Amino acid sequence: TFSREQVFTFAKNFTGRARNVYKVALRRVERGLQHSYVGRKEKKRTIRSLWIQRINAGCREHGFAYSALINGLNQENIQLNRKVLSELAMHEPDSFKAVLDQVRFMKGQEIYANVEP
């Protein structure tokens, strides 16, 4: 069981009797800590959902689809994840478009260490 010092440190921002009354605050503190364990798990699900929505919106502006892009990347051996792709569509439109054109049309110029073999 938490001590008085621990309980009131956790409950400093609660409302009414939940702030300074031990019996009321102790039950409020334990329920809140239970919410946090569930919250950290759900955070990982929600953020990935947001990345996909932004990627899909950018793809369709050019006439493409999210599912077509993911399949196309794996065929080209490109391993950029969804967090990076989402940021490219929002802040780097030109680089995001270049990735789409390579996947769809494959018209990029290859680079070799020895330019003139």
Partner: protein, 200 residues
Amino acid sequence: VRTKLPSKRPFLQTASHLAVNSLVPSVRTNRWADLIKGPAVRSCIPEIPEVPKPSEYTTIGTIEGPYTLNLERVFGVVELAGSQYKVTPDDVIFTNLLHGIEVNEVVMLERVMLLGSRSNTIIGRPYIPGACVLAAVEEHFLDGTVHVFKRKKRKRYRRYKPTRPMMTTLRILKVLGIDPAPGDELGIPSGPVIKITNTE
């Protein structure tokens, strides 16, 4: 059989076979399956070779004193500590704890996946050979406390286990591999003075 007492039949049969074997020798003395048993092997198929990857991070020197940084017009994507980062000079990133480095040291990151500017883009499949990113180690810190709590209503079950994660902080200094677009060149000194201490 109705009884729940465990049966002793296997014990009674074993005692009979052991007594017979002890006193009466067998007639056969060989077994073909044992005679031609071959040597033990690890597997029946060739092993699958592994795919090489560029080095993650390596030290190249130390920082001598206070410095300043300016903004540039290039960016890249680098893989580090199990996750990818989009970085440009003067950025600060937070990663898991990195072993074998100290504060005020310069490290080299080679797993570069994408380079871009305002006039060109280079895509790695999956990595770009001949590109790198430089960074400075700024912190090895313990993050904020995370309180872990479990309880089961009406079962007299309660567990409390606070913890503090370990992390590392870096500041991006330079991105190498792609030239800035015309008119975007930084024509002044930008970074610190580095004492090179890694010659191979």
